[PDB]
Amino acid sequence: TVGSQELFSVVAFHCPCSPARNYLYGLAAIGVPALVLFIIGIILNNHTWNLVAECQHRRTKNCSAAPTFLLLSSILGRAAVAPVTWSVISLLRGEAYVCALSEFVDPSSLTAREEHFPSAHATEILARFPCKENPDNLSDFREEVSRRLRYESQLFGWLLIGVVAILVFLTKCLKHYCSPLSYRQEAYWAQYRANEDQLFQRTAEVHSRVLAANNVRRFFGFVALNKDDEELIANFPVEGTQPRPQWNAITGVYLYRENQGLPLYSRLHKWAQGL
Amino acid sequence: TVGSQELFSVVAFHCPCSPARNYLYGLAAIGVPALVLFIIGIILNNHTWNLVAECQHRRTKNCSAAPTFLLLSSILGRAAVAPVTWSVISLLRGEAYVCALSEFVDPSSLTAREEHFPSAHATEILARFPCKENPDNLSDFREEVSRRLRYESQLFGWLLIGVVAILVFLTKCLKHYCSPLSYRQEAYWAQYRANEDQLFQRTAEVHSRVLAANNVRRFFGFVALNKDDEELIANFPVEGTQPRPQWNAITGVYLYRENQGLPLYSRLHKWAQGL
Amino acid sequence: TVGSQELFSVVAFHCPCSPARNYLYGLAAIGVPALVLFIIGIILNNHTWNLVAECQHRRTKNCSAAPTFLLLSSILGRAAVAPVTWSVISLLRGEAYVCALSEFVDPSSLTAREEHFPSAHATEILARFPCKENPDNLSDFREEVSRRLRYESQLFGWLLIGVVAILVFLTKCLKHYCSPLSYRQEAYWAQYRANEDQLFQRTAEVHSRVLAANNVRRFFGFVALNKDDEELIANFPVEGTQPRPQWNAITGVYLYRENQGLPLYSRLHKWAQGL
Amino acid sequence: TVGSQELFSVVAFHCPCSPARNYLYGLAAIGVPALVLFIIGIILNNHTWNLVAECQHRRTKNCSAAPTFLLLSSILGRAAVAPVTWSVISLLRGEAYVCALSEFVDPSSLTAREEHFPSAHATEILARFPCKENPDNLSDFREEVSRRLRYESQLFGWLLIGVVAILVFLTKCLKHYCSPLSYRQEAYWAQYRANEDQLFQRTAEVHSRVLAANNVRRFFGFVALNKDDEELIANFPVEGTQPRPQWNAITGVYLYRENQGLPLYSRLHKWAQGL
Amino acid sequence: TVGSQELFSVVAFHCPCSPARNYLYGLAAIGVPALVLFIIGIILNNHTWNLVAECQHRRTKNCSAAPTFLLLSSILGRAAVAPVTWSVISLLRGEAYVCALSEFVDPSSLTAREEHFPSAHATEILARFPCKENPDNLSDFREEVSRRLRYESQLFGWLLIGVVAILVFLTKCLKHYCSPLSYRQEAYWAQYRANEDQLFQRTAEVHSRVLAANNVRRFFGFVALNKDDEELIANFPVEGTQPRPQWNAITGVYLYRENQGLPLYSRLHKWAQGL
Amino acid sequence: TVGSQELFSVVAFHCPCSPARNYLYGLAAIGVPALVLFIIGIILNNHTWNLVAECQHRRTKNCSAAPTFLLLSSILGRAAVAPVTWSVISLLRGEAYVCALSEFVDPSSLTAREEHFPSAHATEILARFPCKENPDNLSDFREEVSRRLRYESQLFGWLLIGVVAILVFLTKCLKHYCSPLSYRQEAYWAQYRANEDQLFQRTAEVHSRVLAANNVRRFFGFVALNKDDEELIANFPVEGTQPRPQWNAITGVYLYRENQGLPLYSRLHKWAQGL
Amino acid sequence: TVGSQELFSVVAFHCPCSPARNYLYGLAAIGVPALVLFIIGIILNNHTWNLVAECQHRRTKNCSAAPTFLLLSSILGRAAVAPVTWSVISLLRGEAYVCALSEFVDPSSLTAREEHFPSAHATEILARFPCKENPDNLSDFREEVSRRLRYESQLFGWLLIGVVAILVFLTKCLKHYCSPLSYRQEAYWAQYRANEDQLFQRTAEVHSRVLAANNVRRFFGFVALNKDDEELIANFPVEGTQPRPQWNAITGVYLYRENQGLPLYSRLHKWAQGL
């Protein structure tokens, strides 16, 4: 609240009342926060790196661009919410759009009201309306064009949130309509991927810690463990880790080939059933 | 409250006092929030995806469009409450409707009051009434037309909530009147569907976790479990998962065929009794 | 309190000071909230669906319309409190009734006070009294007619709450006077219906859960239970559920036939004693 | 908050309204805090000292400058966030940039407004605009140039945060695209480095303490231990510490050579597998 | 906060507006608090006394001035932070520097503004500017020279904090670049010195207490112990303390000679391995 | 705070604006609180009485005046902090010094400003400046001389705290440079003196209490003990106390003679090793 | 605080502005509270009664007046702090001294200022200055003489606290310089006197209670005890109390004769060793 206002004050809009310049600032303050939120949505997502590790060394578009497209749909479903929550919250606030298109209004009524105002004065005085710099001779006209431009901004924001709503609906019906499986089995697959990822993180931490303890014990002569780590060395000994081709056989896109009719829900499962 | 007001301020109405434009903004601010709430009501509902998975790969309208209609009635019963709670709360507030139909009033009394006001000035000055931009010569007239339009809005909101009340009553009497069973057995069926869905989610998480643990143990040499997961591996071993036609035999619309007189309340129950 | 005022503000009355229109708004704001509260009182009641399931597939008015009438008396006793608590709280507040019948007053004293006011001006200026739009020449007259109309509203509200009081008294003496049994046995019957309904809901949840667990165990190979559900599978096994004619023999109106003199308090009890 | 304001007051900007001087102060107050935050980001990072210990006594650029480049990428990923969070928070506040480029504006409109103002007076009066020292004859002109310069500052800040966003995205895709391994194995490697570093710190403290206790016991005749340290002497005796070439074999850049196909995740692991 | 302000009020600056005197006061209030903080940084550091005990009775610069230089680098790293945090917090506040160099400004513009002001009046009126004692004829000129001098102070403070940042960076790269060992072994050495110092303080307190108890018991006939001290006498008896040449063999600079390849991390360790 | 202000109000300065008198009051209010704090620093210190008991009956300056000088250095290190914290807090407040030397200023500018003011009036009006009793003709002159005298006071306070800082640094380097031992052994000696003094106080209380209990039991026939004192009589019986020459052999200056090379850290230790 | 102010208000000073009378009131309000605090310091001290019981019936100044002088030094050390904390807190407040010596000032400047004021008017108007009863013709003169008299009071208070500080220092060096013993043995003696006095009070209460219980049991037939008193009768029986010459052999001044070289720290110890 307090720190939220103290951070929202610097990011707040300040319309530069200048023609052919304010619309560039409006485009920046709309798009560039939406762009950085979009790119950190791709950054925060981990399955993007699964995709790039799938296509870099394998160089395999052999299946199709469609499993990559469904993966990318999950990417943008995690990611692209952040640009579109910013674009609509700017558009319905309308400040960026009035600062954008204040210098594009038909000045005919303004020229009739301002005793034949010339386009050199008209475009510049149109740009000065979002700073409320209109005089008393044009304050009502500035309020009228400000309300019409606020209308256009809010209508564009509502149309954009409507079309992204129908877009997310259509990609859900596409994902369930181009599905190679049920929706109960897709839920089982989602729970399998969550269980495998959580179990794999936990066992990677445990196996890495046991390997580190064996190396340290080889160095010093002993190790410094809590009782939990003493139980870890007691329970799960290691002779050696896993080779890098065997590690490469695990990563990649989540396949759904079915070995001998029985399904394989991930590449680790494919690798385990392959042995 | 505080954050509720801070979010309600941006979504709040701002009537663009301009003719043949303000009614489009009123239609947008009524319908498009109602449309996005309606479509996310279809999104949040999971049985929609049961319906689309029933009609996509089976392509079966073989039973009727009436079980799909009862399913869709449940869909809209979960979903369509959100557009209609928005349309009435906008209509009884009346701001969207006065901003809509301020530019449609018979201007005859306005022309008589405003010394033969022409329709070029009359429609534009009618559009400026929701901004309270009427002068002292027409402030009382603006209050009169504002109260009459607020009357029309509130009457339409009350009629719409009345007709959706009689509509939900008629679809309940339709559902109980076109019911192939009792209402105690329908309650037993609802409790069966809740128990099967909850038990199936829990056993899907458990079986997925045990399969993931077997794959990980095949990879590393062990697994990292809490004591609960150690009990899970101790209690429920798995040799193999279930094939995809057997998974497809589970999904679909909730049938109520009765094998040999004895009822089958869901497709899993049909599949279990079939063996 | 705060949210209560924030919700009561939108539902609050706004009298459209316009003749032959304000009484329609008063009728709407009285009746339509009373109508929707009445219809959701029928919706929230579950025994309505018992009645419609009794008369739909059996099509049996064979006993009489009088057990249906006593059932409907219980329906309206649960239900119709909500329209009548709304109609009196509107009537004693009087705003809906003054907005209704402000445009129906005898304007003879108003014509004498307003220097022969014509009925074109008189009816419209009568409609403008609930907005307190009377001038200083008629402010005292507006206060007089407002107090007389508030009298008429409050007297009608008190008469309506009195007549619904005598109505609920007469239907209680009818129910105890057309009773086929004592009032201690009617209390025993009410406690029997409560015990049967609660026990039947609990055993329906339990039996549905055990059937769902048997189907799931047939599918996966095991089930995911808490210790309570493990006790449930341990205690109450199921071979098969109950057929639909046997389920139809349970539903219906609460009979009080007496098999061989010994009473049967519900159709489940009739069905159990019949075996 | 309170102490935060008391510390932010001294570091706050104070634009010296003087030509060819204020831009040096703006460059200082932007860059030098960014420079000291950058250099303490290199200081706080410990892997910088791993790099300098790798290149000092070994003098080995024998592998490539690319593992040093990936290490330095991790260095700047930990470090360089602090200069760029300062440069943008200064740039979007705009005070440093208006104090920088107030003395560079085209004074043609200022000379036309100020009755042929000469460049000796014009540059100095341009420098006095960030102190709001313009008179009433040029207050509106000062507001116009201040808003245009605030536009230029905020646009440069948004462009810089956008380009560092695309830069961090490109270096992540470079790191995953020039990766000699998977991304699951890179996660296993990160967890191995964390486990080895934590276990090595704990066992270094323990082994150092046991060596210190043996030296002290050699001096006095006994030692002063808590019960934990008594357990430490009871569990891990030491005959001698490790020689300095063996200590040098541990430090250095994190290699990923693979001895006989089996991977070696750190130089301690390389040293342990080498024996 | 409250006591902090009550202590900061007396140490606060009071510029004596007098020529060739105020700069001496500014130099005092900058340097002398920085000098006393520097000298108590040398006082609070204990390794300074290790250095002076190393060079006093041994009189040995036999190794080099470079281990003394690295020790002194640690001394100033603990110590010299306190003068430089004072000099910059005075310089960025700027009061000491404006009070210093207010009596050194070029008075040519002041002589032109003050109707040929002579240097006898000009230097004295320049000294009176930090008390804001300029009249209305020179208040704007005083504000201009005050802002320029505040610029010079803040620029000097930023340059000084930048150069001490690069200085601490260069001495860290010197310490790691002139290191006779790794950085992991330097961390092991730091943990060894911490463990030896803590264990030696604890065992010095324990051994001193046991010796005192033996002397007191020799005097009175018994001792007054808590149960902890009773355990101390029970566990660690003493026959005699350690001789002064053996005590001198412990103190001195932290050597890193390596006896027979195996390292010796401190002089106590050298003394223990020597036996 | 509140009581602190209520006590600081009476000790607060009240400058008697009178020539050749106010400087005596300033000297009193500076020195006499510093003198009483210095003498109670000698009073609160207990080792002063060790020194006077060493030199009174022994009359022995036989060792040197240098162990007495090191003891006195410890005396003043405990003691003399209290006068010097008072002198600087008075000097930097400056009130005592302006009240001192207000009657010593060169009155030449005052005589030129006050229309040839005579030294009979000039010295008395100089003394009245610390009461702010200067008129409007000399208020600015009084402010100038007050600021110059406040400068002189604060500069003297800073120089005095600087010279006592270098003094305490030089006596620490003297104590470590004229040390007959290490600094680790000096720390062991300090811990020995603390342990011997604490153990000797506790055993003096215990032995005195047991002797008192034996005398009382000889008088009454029994004693009144708590359980702790019952344990004290149970554990440490006494036949007789220690003779006065044996008590005199304990007191005196802390010697560091070394009997047969082995050190003796106090006279009790010398006495115990002597037997 | 509140009650402290309510008690300090009545004891507060009220200077009777009357010549040759106000100084008697100042002498009373200084001395008589100091006198009553001094005499209750002698009253609260118990060793005064030891002294008077030593000199009354024995009538023995046989040792010297010097042990009585050291005892009296302890008496005044406990006692005389209370008059001297009152005299200085009155003197530094200065009200008693200005009320004392306002009627003693040289009236020559007052006679020159008051148009040859006669000594009949001058002494009386000098006495009225502490009530601030001087007119505007002498308000500044009253402030001058009030500040000079406040100077004289505060200087006398500081000189008195300084001389009592040097006095308490000299009597401590006298007590340690005329000591017949060490200062460790004096501390042992102080702890012996504290232990004997505390043990003697406790055993006097216990022995008196047991004697009272035996007398009561001789009267009634039993006694009423708590469990603690039951333990007291169980543990310490009494046959008879101690005779009055044996009681007189205990009281008296604390001797330090040494029987056969071994010391005797109190007369009870002398009496016990004598048997």
Coordinates of C-alpha atoms in Angstrom, one line a residue, chain F residues 10-12 14-18 21 24-25 28-29 32-33 35-36 39 42-43 46 49-50 52-53 55-57 128 131 196-197 200-201 204-205 207-209 211-216 218-220 222-226 229 239-244 247-248 250-252 254 268, chain G residues 88-89 92-93 144 147-148 150-151 154-155 158-159 161-162 165-166 168-169 172-173 176-188 191-192 195-196 198-200 202-204 206-207 210 236-238 240 242 246-247 250 256 258 261-263 265 268-269 271-273 275:
Chain F
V10 CA 19.5 22.4 37.7
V11 CA 23.0 21.5 36.5
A12 CA 22.3 23.6 33.3
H14 CA 23.3 30.2 33.6
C15 CA 25.9 32.7 32.4
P16 CA 26.3 35.7 34.8
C17 CA 26.6 38.6 32.4
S18 CA 29.2 40.5 34.4
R21 CA 33.1 37.2 37.0
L24 CA 35.2 32.3 36.9
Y25 CA 31.7 30.7 36.6
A28 CA 33.8 26.4 37.8
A29 CA 31.0 24.8 35.8
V32 CA 34.5 21.3 39.2
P33 CA 32.1 18.7 37.7
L35 CA 37.0 17.4 39.1
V36 CA 34.3 15.6 41.1
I39 CA 37.8 12.1 42.0
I42 CA 39.5 7.4 41.7
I43 CA 37.0 6.5 44.5
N46 CA 39.3 -0.4 43.9
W49 CA 43.3 1.2 47.5
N50 CA 45.5 -1.7 46.5
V52 CA 47.8 2.9 48.8
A53 CA 47.9 -0.3 50.8
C55 CA 52.8 2.0 49.6
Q56 CA 51.6 2.8 53.1
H57 CA 52.9 0.1 55.5
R128 CA 26.3 41.0 28.6
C131 CA 22.6 36.8 27.9
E196 CA 41.1 -14.9 41.3
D197 CA 39.2 -11.9 42.4
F200 CA 38.3 -14.8 46.3
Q201 CA 35.2 -12.8 46.9
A204 CA 35.6 -14.9 51.4
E205 CA 31.9 -14.6 51.7
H207 CA 34.5 -18.6 54.8
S208 CA 33.2 -15.5 56.7
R209 CA 29.8 -17.0 56.8
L211 CA 33.1 -18.5 60.8
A212 CA 30.1 -16.4 61.8
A213 CA 28.0 -19.6 62.0
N214 CA 30.6 -21.2 64.3
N215 CA 30.7 -18.2 66.6
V216 CA 26.9 -18.0 66.7
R218 CA 29.0 -21.2 70.1
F219 CA 26.8 -18.5 71.5
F220 CA 23.2 -19.7 71.2
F222 CA 22.5 -23.6 67.1
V223 CA 22.2 -21.5 64.0
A224 CA 19.5 -20.4 61.6
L225 CA 20.4 -21.5 58.1
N226 CA 18.7 -21.9 54.8
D229 CA 23.9 -22.4 54.2
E239 CA 39.2 -24.6 62.5
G240 CA 40.8 -21.1 62.3
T241 CA 41.2 -18.1 60.0
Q242 CA 44.4 -16.8 58.5
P243 CA 46.9 -14.6 60.4
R244 CA 47.4 -11.0 59.5
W247 CA 46.9 -11.6 54.9
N248 CA 49.5 -8.9 54.2
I250 CA 48.4 -11.4 49.7
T251 CA 47.8 -7.7 49.2
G252 CA 50.0 -5.4 47.2
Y254 CA 50.3 -7.4 41.0
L268 CA 48.4 -15.1 46.1
Chain G
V88 CA 23.8 21.7 47.0
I89 CA 20.4 21.1 45.4
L92 CA 22.5 25.4 42.6
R93 CA 18.8 26.2 42.4
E144 CA 21.5 41.9 36.7
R147 CA 22.1 36.8 37.8
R148 CA 25.1 37.9 39.9
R150 CA 22.6 33.2 41.1
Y151 CA 26.3 33.1 40.1
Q154 CA 25.9 28.3 42.0
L155 CA 29.6 28.9 42.6
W158 CA 30.0 23.8 43.2
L159 CA 32.7 24.7 45.6
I161 CA 30.4 19.7 46.4
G162 CA 34.0 19.9 45.4
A165 CA 34.4 15.3 47.3
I166 CA 38.0 16.0 48.4
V168 CA 35.4 12.0 51.3
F169 CA 38.6 11.2 49.3
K172 CA 39.0 7.2 52.5
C173 CA 42.8 7.6 52.2
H176 CA 43.2 3.0 54.3
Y177 CA 46.3 4.9 55.6
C178 CA 45.5 4.5 59.3
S179 CA 44.4 0.9 58.7
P180 CA 45.8 -1.7 61.0
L181 CA 45.4 -4.3 58.3
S182 CA 45.2 -5.0 54.6
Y183 CA 42.3 -4.0 52.3
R184 CA 41.6 -7.6 51.4
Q185 CA 41.3 -8.4 55.1
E186 CA 39.2 -5.3 55.5
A187 CA 36.9 -6.7 52.8
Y188 CA 36.9 -10.1 54.7
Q191 CA 31.8 -9.7 54.9
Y192 CA 32.3 -11.2 58.3
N195 CA 27.4 -12.5 57.8
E196 CA 27.5 -12.3 61.6
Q198 CA 22.5 -11.5 59.3
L199 CA 23.0 -14.9 61.0
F200 CA 22.6 -13.3 64.4
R202 CA 18.0 -14.9 62.0
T203 CA 19.1 -17.0 64.9
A204 CA 17.7 -14.4 67.3
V206 CA 14.5 -18.4 65.7
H207 CA 15.7 -18.7 69.3
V210 CA 11.4 -21.2 70.3
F236 CA 16.5 -26.4 68.0
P237 CA 15.4 -27.0 71.5
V238 CA 16.2 -24.6 74.3
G240 CA 17.7 -21.6 78.8
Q242 CA 21.9 -16.4 77.8
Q246 CA 27.3 -12.7 78.5
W247 CA 25.0 -10.5 76.4
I250 CA 28.9 -9.3 72.8
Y256 CA 40.5 -6.0 66.2
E258 CA 44.5 -10.6 67.8
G261 CA 48.4 -13.8 66.5
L262 CA 45.2 -15.3 65.2
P263 CA 42.7 -12.4 64.5
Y265 CA 37.0 -9.9 63.9
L268 CA 31.3 -12.4 69.4
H269 CA 34.3 -13.9 67.8
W271 CA 33.9 -14.2 73.1
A272 CA 33.8 -17.5 71.2
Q273 CA 37.6 -17.8 70.9
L275 CA 36.1 -20.1 75.4

